[PDB]
Amino acid sequence: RNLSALKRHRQSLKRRLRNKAKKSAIKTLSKKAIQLAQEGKAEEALKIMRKAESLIDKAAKGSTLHKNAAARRKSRLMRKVRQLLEAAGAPLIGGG
Amino acid sequence: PKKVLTGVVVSDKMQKTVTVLVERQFPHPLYGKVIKRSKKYLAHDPEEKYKLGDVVEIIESRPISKRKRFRVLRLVESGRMDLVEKYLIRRQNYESLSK
Amino acid sequence: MVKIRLARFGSKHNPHYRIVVTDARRKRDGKYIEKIGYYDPRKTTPDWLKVDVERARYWLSVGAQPTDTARRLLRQAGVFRQ
Amino acid sequence: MIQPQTYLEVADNTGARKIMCIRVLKGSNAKYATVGDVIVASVKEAIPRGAVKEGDVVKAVVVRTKKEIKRPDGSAIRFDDNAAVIINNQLEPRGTRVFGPVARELREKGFMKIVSLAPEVL
RNA sequence: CCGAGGGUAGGGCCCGUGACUGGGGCGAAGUCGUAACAAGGUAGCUGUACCGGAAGGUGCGGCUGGAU
RNA sequence: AGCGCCGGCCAACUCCGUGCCAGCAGCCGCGGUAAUACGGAGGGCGCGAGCGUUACCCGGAUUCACUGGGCGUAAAGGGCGUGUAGGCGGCCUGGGGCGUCCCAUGUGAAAGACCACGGCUCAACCGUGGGGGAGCGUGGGAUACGCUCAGGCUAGACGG
RNA sequence: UUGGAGAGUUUGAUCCUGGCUCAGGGUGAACGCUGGCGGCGUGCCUAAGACAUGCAAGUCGUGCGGGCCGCGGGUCCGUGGUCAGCGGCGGACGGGUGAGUAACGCGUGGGUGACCUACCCGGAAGAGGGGGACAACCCGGGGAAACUCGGGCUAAUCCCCCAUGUGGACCCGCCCCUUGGGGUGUGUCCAAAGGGCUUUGCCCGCUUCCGGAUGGGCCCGCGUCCCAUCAGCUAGUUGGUGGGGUAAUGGCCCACCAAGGCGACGACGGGUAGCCGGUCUGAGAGGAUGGCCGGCCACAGGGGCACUGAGACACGGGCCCCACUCCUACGGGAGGCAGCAGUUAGGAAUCUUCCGCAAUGGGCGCAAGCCUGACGGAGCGACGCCGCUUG
RNA sequence: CCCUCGCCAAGGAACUCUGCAAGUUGGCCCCGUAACUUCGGGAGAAGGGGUGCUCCCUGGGGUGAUGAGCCCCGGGGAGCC
Ligand SMILES: [Mg+2]
Ligand SMILES: [Mg+2]
Ligand SMILES: [Mg+2]
Ligand SMILES: [Mg+2]
Ligand SMILES: [Mg+2]
Ligand SMILES: [Mg+2]
Ligand SMILES: [Mg+2]
Ligand SMILES: [Mg+2]
Ligand SMILES: [Mg+2]
Ligand SMILES: [Mg+2]
Ligand SMILES: [Mg+2]
Ligand SMILES: [Mg+2]
Ligand SMILES: [Mg+2]
Ligand SMILES: [Mg+2]
Ligand SMILES: [Mg+2]
Ligand SMILES: [Mg+2]
Ligand SMILES: [Mg+2]
Ligand SMILES: [Mg+2]
Ligand SMILES: [Mg+2]
Ligand SMILES: [Mg+2]
Ligand SMILES: [Mg+2]
Ligand SMILES: [Mg+2]
Ligand SMILES: [Mg+2]
Ligand SMILES: [Mg+2]
Ligand SMILES: [Mg+2]
Ligand SMILES: [Mg+2]
Ligand SMILES: [Mg+2]
Ligand SMILES: [Mg+2]
Ligand SMILES: [Mg+2]
Ligand SMILES: [Mg+2]
Ligand SMILES: [Mg+2]
Ligand SMILES: [Mg+2]
Ligand SMILES: [Mg+2]
Ligand SMILES: [Mg+2]
Ligand SMILES: [Mg+2]
Ligand SMILES: [Mg+2]
Ligand SMILES: [Mg+2]
Ligand SMILES: [Mg+2]
Ligand SMILES: [Mg+2]
Ligand SMILES: [Mg+2]
Ligand SMILES: [Mg+2]
Ligand SMILES: [Mg+2]
Ligand SMILES: [Mg+2]
Ligand SMILES: [Mg+2]
Ligand SMILES: [Mg+2]
Ligand SMILES: [Mg+2]
Ligand SMILES: [Mg+2]
Ligand SMILES: [Mg+2]
Ligand SMILES: [Mg+2]
Ligand SMILES: [Mg+2]
Ligand SMILES: [Mg+2]
Ligand SMILES: [Mg+2]
Ligand SMILES: [Mg+2]
Ligand SMILES: [Mg+2]
Ligand SMILES: [Mg+2]
Ligand SMILES: [Mg+2]
Ligand SMILES: [Mg+2]
Ligand SMILES: [Mg+2]
Ligand SMILES: [Mg+2]
Ligand SMILES: [Mg+2]
Ligand SMILES: [Mg+2]
Ligand SMILES: [Mg+2]
Ligand SMILES: [Mg+2]
Ligand SMILES: [Mg+2]
Ligand SMILES: [Mg+2]
Ligand SMILES: [Mg+2]
Ligand SMILES: [Mg+2]
Ligand SMILES: [Mg+2]
Ligand SMILES: [Mg+2]
Ligand SMILES: [Mg+2]
Ligand SMILES: [Mg+2]
Ligand SMILES: [Mg+2]
Ligand SMILES: [Mg+2]
Ligand SMILES: [Mg+2]
Ligand SMILES: [Mg+2]
Ligand SMILES: [Mg+2]
Ligand SMILES: [Mg+2]
Ligand SMILES: [Mg+2]
Ligand SMILES: [Mg+2]
Ligand SMILES: [Mg+2]
Ligand SMILES: [Mg+2]
Ligand SMILES: [Mg+2]
Ligand SMILES: [Mg+2]
Ligand SMILES: [Mg+2]
Ligand SMILES: [Mg+2]
Ligand SMILES: [Mg+2]
Ligand SMILES: [Mg+2]
Ligand SMILES: [Mg+2]
Ligand SMILES: [Mg+2]
Ligand SMILES: [Mg+2]
Ligand SMILES: [Mg+2]
Ligand SMILES: [Mg+2]
Ligand SMILES: [Mg+2]
Ligand SMILES: [Mg+2]
Ligand SMILES: [Mg+2]
Ligand SMILES: [Mg+2]
Ligand SMILES: [Mg+2]
Ligand SMILES: [Mg+2]
Ligand SMILES: [Mg+2]
Ligand SMILES: [Mg+2]
Ligand SMILES: [Mg+2]
Ligand SMILES: [Mg+2]
Ligand SMILES: [Mg+2]
Ligand SMILES: [Mg+2]
Ligand SMILES: [Mg+2]
Ligand SMILES: [Mg+2]
Ligand SMILES: [Mg+2]
Ligand SMILES: [Mg+2]
Ligand SMILES: [Mg+2]
Ligand SMILES: [Mg+2]
Ligand SMILES: [Mg+2]
Ligand SMILES: [Mg+2]
Ligand SMILES: [Mg+2]
Ligand SMILES: [Mg+2]
Ligand SMILES: [Mg+2]
Ligand SMILES: [Mg+2]
Ligand SMILES: [Mg+2]
Ligand SMILES: [Mg+2]
Ligand SMILES: [Mg+2]
């Protein structure tokens, strides 16, 4: 009745924690930054936007995000922030 | 290569899409005779430039929608409403094949 | 990885391998990527071994890994002579 | 308080879904069956190809009731339906699982086989 | 939110079965008659229609695949 | 050493028993007191660690017919018109080259199959080599017939 | 041009039409009567019914820290083994089955400027500096079991932060290119793990990039059975705009907008079937078939779901619902042979609870090696073919 | 005790000649709706969902003047008890 498949399930549970955890933050922040950029609030948007971009590429280092997801996530972030600022402008920090 | 086919536009009642009817001949696999069979392709026309009656070429393309996997390649001839009639008269005849 | 090994053909108590390049995850006697020679362990004919050597060096050159008892039948045909 | 005409849910897998009481087997002239009592019943609704079929006259022990049963310790328990498990002449379920809880009263009345198969006993 | 499924209600197709019932095939050792095959003893056949224990008959119109 | 068969198809014949019985049977048919046709027997024919039966597939079936059938009376012409789709379509000349045809090239895995050789004492089985194909992609080419566009005609058809 | 036989039976007789019938080959066969040997094959076609027991997936101390027994010898140390744990890599292969599916499932040829790919190979560069968790372990609570709850401790190839930027990712501009292909400038963002020897040197690793190789995802043309006594079907339906999602296109999902899409070239519906390489027959054309072997697909008691991951929506992993069965101390809990054998039911009918990792192959490992019901062999059965005997 | 009326545990027609009587159902809006048919119907078949208030956005009509005010018929969103 036993296995080390058990072990393998034991671990999956734990990786799952770190993953979910990581993806939550990425969404929390992009949203936070898109939210700012709508009412922009130019400098602050861009500030958080970097903090997302960091967090994205950081998840992409491992198994959480496939690198293209990171690419895709990042692309859609920047597109949103910028085009939001165009209803008002102008970009306070970097970037870019 | 990407498959290219030539046909008549039979519908433009969609936005940014035309229905292009492609026809083909081939010998019957047993009875020899050359027989025709036709088929409609939904073709991407981002420019809404192709119109009813146009004879056109369409090229197999990366999928645009469910059912749309061809873009219109280029115009070939304009105003073949006589073909569009052929198609339409057949559909219209269907009202007589029921019960 | 892609591998070079022996696919058992022939029959019972009558081996006849084909030195062959296949994906490691194939079955033994499965679809191979390419045949490149054969081997008769019972040695029952003038040429109980043969190898396209020009080829076996390509697959090696591009990363194929031979089995142990294939490495040998590739040495014995001097695909390793430097 | 089950009486002739009362419909009961059947809490087993005999295939009977609903039975209607036709008699309470408790003496010469009992007015009501409660938990642990045996009735005779008609099968009014069953599923296809079970042990039992609509029309069958079977026996069943009442295993939970919508009128609350009171207990010597001053408490009472009440269920959301009236349910009975179909039995044979030796009080053994004719079925092989029993669904939903059952009243502990069944045990003191020698329905051990039913009490054990039950997911819960309240 | 969606969601396995559960429940309620109304539909569609299919299969099994049913008091009784309609003809059908066969069997054949029976009853009744002899409608068709000969001009088959009323030429036949026919669509329809009415009718008769039964094959059938008669009307109307048709065909000859009718003998003399 | 067994099993089927011995009326015809189909290779293999006599005696007894039975008497429209018992029974055989794939089709035609056998048995009602001289049965090569039932049952046994002798003998015979065919196969042989097999022989027979049942089932199913193709075959014979040109009996769904493309190769390769038919419709007065054998089964089979729609009761008759009108006409939609479709299928099919006269003579001459050009353009296009879709069908069609040619060449090249890719693909057409391995096994199997086919030809050669070879290994198990043979074979089956198994190995090495050889030979290709339809079909589809690509490049090039041909233009008679079919197609398509274009221009002529009058024998089809329509009209005065 | 290596290929083509027919016969019986409608009549008193005839010719013709026409059905029935037969001789041939074939099979995963079965039944009867009989039965000696060997070889190669080959054997649940029915209940994708239900299954007792063993076995079918693990490995690494050259990632880490402990326990228990011993070896070496002064409490401590080393060394070996063994046992879990943490950490890898495998477990997505391999093996079974054919239920579902008439579909881009399969076949064949194509497309991806719309994509991914662990371990393998080639080439470019790199490994500085910090901090933390959780088991094992000690301490309590709960059971008959399954087991688990809580308190605290500790290591690492575990986790995180900063540093470093060859490079790589992303927005904007611009050049080539022309669907999202390649290049470039500014801004922003992202690396890491070390272990081992013979120890200023090598081996196995770890990191980011580029290319390769292999394996895949998706897309399109054409082909793929019976019923028209199924003729009409369609509201995520057909298209569009924006977003969501993915590796990636897409009504795959969602909001809004338009009113479209399909159908006698047979939609919709019903029935039946996994498809192919092939197989069997046939002169051929064709018909029939898809068992064994190879390829793809689909499924893992019936259903739904996602997690982990390069890869799964995972046969011997997880969650939930159902059905069934079992266990128990009656409180509770457990299972999924369509893996190999084996039992039972069903059936006209289909095998040993065998042996071995020696060979080929696969997994982990520097290696020794360990695991391997894949496989290699052996057993049963005239089931088939081939060979041989009873002279 | 009778009349008229309100409620009722579990059951739910077992009442009785008979569900007699009383329950149930109940308006409007939307979805949806069978046999059969004289093609009207059967149909309010059946069955089901919605129904208050608050804020924001919004479409058309009447009266005006084309506008404001007034009156009429809507739609979409977010919420509250
Ligand atoms: Mg492990
Ligand atoms: Mg949040
Ligand atoms: Mg992931
Ligand atoms: Mg990644
Ligand atoms: Mg689109
Ligand atoms: Mg009944
Ligand atoms: Mg639902
Ligand atoms: Mg439902
Ligand atoms: Mg449920
Ligand atoms: Mg009768
Ligand atoms: Mg007469
Ligand atoms: Mg007469
Ligand atoms: Mg007469
Ligand atoms: Mg008459
Ligand atoms: Mg009379
Ligand atoms: Mg009369
Ligand atoms: Mg006339
Ligand atoms: Mg014979
Ligand atoms: Mg013969
Ligand atoms: Mg003879
Ligand atoms: Mg006798
Ligand atoms: Mg005699
Ligand atoms: Mg005979
Ligand atoms: Mg005889
Ligand atoms: Mg023999
Ligand atoms: Mg036949
Ligand atoms: Mg013949
Ligand atoms: Mg034929
Ligand atoms: Mg013909
Ligand atoms: Mg004929
Ligand atoms: Mg006529
Ligand atoms: Mg008529
Ligand atoms: Mg015409
Ligand atoms: Mg024409
Ligand atoms: Mg012509
Ligand atoms: Mg051409
Ligand atoms: Mg070719
Ligand atoms: Mg081949
Ligand atoms: Mg050939
Ligand atoms: Mg030889
Ligand atoms: Mg060969
Ligand atoms: Mg010409
Ligand atoms: Mg002309
Ligand atoms: Mg003329
Ligand atoms: Mg006769
Ligand atoms: Mg006659
Ligand atoms: Mg005769
Ligand atoms: Mg004949
Ligand atoms: Mg036998
Ligand atoms: Mg025997
Ligand atoms: Mg054997
Ligand atoms: Mg099976
Ligand atoms: Mg069953
Ligand atoms: Mg069972
Ligand atoms: Mg073992
Ligand atoms: Mg290591
Ligand atoms: Mg060891
Ligand atoms: Mg360990
Ligand atoms: Mg597999
Ligand atoms: Mg196998
Ligand atoms: Mg199947
Ligand atoms: Mg279907
Ligand atoms: Mg298709
Ligand atoms: Mg395809
Ligand atoms: Mg992995
Ligand atoms: Mg520490
Ligand atoms: Mg950093
Ligand atoms: Mg919508
Ligand atoms: Mg889009
Ligand atoms: Mg994925
Ligand atoms: Mg859709
Ligand atoms: Mg079509
Ligand atoms: Mg049809
Ligand atoms: Mg079905
Ligand atoms: Mg099936
Ligand atoms: Mg023939
Ligand atoms: Mg088949
Ligand atoms: Mg079969
Ligand atoms: Mg297979
Ligand atoms: Mg399933
Ligand atoms: Mg499942
Ligand atoms: Mg099962
Ligand atoms: Mg399950
Ligand atoms: Mg698994
Ligand atoms: Mg699973
Ligand atoms: Mg799956
Ligand atoms: Mg698997
Ligand atoms: Mg299993
Ligand atoms: Mg206990
Ligand atoms: Mg539990
Ligand atoms: Mg078990
Ligand atoms: Mg077995
Ligand atoms: Mg049996
Ligand atoms: Mg076997
Ligand atoms: Mg081994
Ligand atoms: Mg090995
Ligand atoms: Mg290794
Ligand atoms: Mg073993
Ligand atoms: Mg009451
Ligand atoms: Mg009540
Ligand atoms: Mg009631
Ligand atoms: Mg009630
Ligand atoms: Mg009564
Ligand atoms: Mg009474
Ligand atoms: Mg009444
Ligand atoms: Mg009343
Ligand atoms: Mg009322
Ligand atoms: Mg009211
Ligand atoms: Mg009322
Ligand atoms: Mg009704
Ligand atoms: Mg009506
Ligand atoms: Mg009525
Ligand atoms: Mg209503
Ligand atoms: Mg209502
Ligand atoms: Mg009010
Ligand atoms: Mg409300
Ligand atoms: Mg209020
Ligand atoms: Mg007024
Ligand atoms: Mg106004």
Q: Which residues pair with B41 in a beta bridge?
A: B20
* Dihedral of alpha carbons A32, A33, A36, A38, sign: negative
* Nucleotides on chain F within 7 angstroms of protein Cβ: 66, 84-88, 98-100, 109-110, 118-120, 125-128, 137-138, 146
Instruction: Report the distance separating Cα C29 and Cα B85, nearest Å.
Output: 60
Distance D103 CA to ligand 116 centre (A): 41
Instruction: Report the distance separating Cα B70 and Cα B59, nearest Å.
Output: 5
Q: Which residues pair with B43 in a beta bridge?
A: B18, B70
C42 with C70: CB under 8 angstroms? no
Structural biology method used: X-ray
D101 with D64: CB under 8 angstroms? yes
Resolution (A): 2.9
* φ, ψ dihedrals at C10, nearest 5°: 75, -135
Instruction: Report the distance separating Cα D62 and Cα D69, nearest Å.
Output: 12
Contacts of C2 (CB under 8 A, 6+ apart): C21, C22, C23, C24, C33, C59, C63, C64, C65
Q: What is the DSSP letter of B33?
A: -
**Whole-number Cα distances in Å, D2 to B55, C12, D10, D58:** 82, 77, 13, 15
**Integer distance in angstroms from CA A84 to C1' G167?**
32
Q: How many domains in chain B?
A: 1
Helix (H) / strand (E) element for C4: namely strand C2-11
**Integer distance in angstroms from CA D67 to C1' H19?**
26
Helix, strand, or coil (residue A60):
coil
Structure tokens at A57: 């590429």
Peptide bond into A41 cis (omega under 30): yes
Helix (H) / strand (E) element for B21: namely strand B17-27
* Nucleotides on chain G within 7 angstroms of protein Cβ: 39-41, 57-59, 85-91, 93-95, 109-121, 147, 159-162, 168-172, 179, 186-192, 208-209, 212-215, 218-223, 231-232, 238-241, 243-252, 258-265, 285-286, 293-296, 307-311, 314, 316-318, 323-326, 328, 330-332, 334-335, 359-363, 374-378
Q: What is the DSSP letter of B73?
A: E
B10-33: string of b/e by CB count within 10 Å (b at 16+)? Answer: bbbeeeebbbbbbeeeeeeeeeee
CA atoms within 13 A on the CB side of C33: 15
**Whole-number Cα distances in Å, B56 to A22, B18, B24, B45, C82:** 52, 10, 15, 11, 63
Domain containing B76 equals 1-99
Task: Find the CATH number of the domain harbouring B20.
Answer: 2.40.50.140
> Which of residues 75-104 of D have CB within 7 Å of strand H?
82
Helix, strand, or coil (residue C70):
helix
Tell me the residue length of chain B: 99
Helix, strand, or coil (residue A12):
helix
Helix, strand, or coil (residue A20):
helix
Instruction: Report the distance separating Cα C14 and Cα C2, nearest Å.
Output: 27
Counts of helices then strands in chain A (DSSP H, E): 3, 0
Q: What is the DSSP letter of D64?
A: E
A6 with A12: CB under 8 angstroms? no
Structure tokens at D68: 């609350």
In this structure, the number of other CB atoms found within 10 A of the CB of residue A59 comes to 23
Instruction: Report the distance separating Cα D17 and Cα D13, nearest Å.
Output: 9
Q: What is the DSSP letter of D77?
A: E
Say which amino acid occupies D40.
V
**Integer distance in angstroms from CA C79 to C1' G168?**
39
Instruction: Report the distance separating Cα C6 and Cα C37, nearest Å.
Output: 10
Burial class for D100, CB neighbours closer than 10 Å (0-12, 13-18, 19+): middle
D13 with D47: CB under 8 angstroms? no
**Integer distance in angstroms from CA D119 to C1' G332?**
10
Contacts of A82 (CB under 8 A, 6+ apart): A37, A91
Structure tokens at C36: 């490149």
Instruction: Report the distance separating Cα C51 and Cα D92, nearest Å.
Output: 77
Instruction: Report the distance separating Cα C24 and Cα D110, nearest Å.
Output: 66
* φ, ψ dihedrals at D75, nearest 5°: -105, 170
Instruction: Report the distance separating Cα B36 and Cα B46, nearest Å.
Output: 31
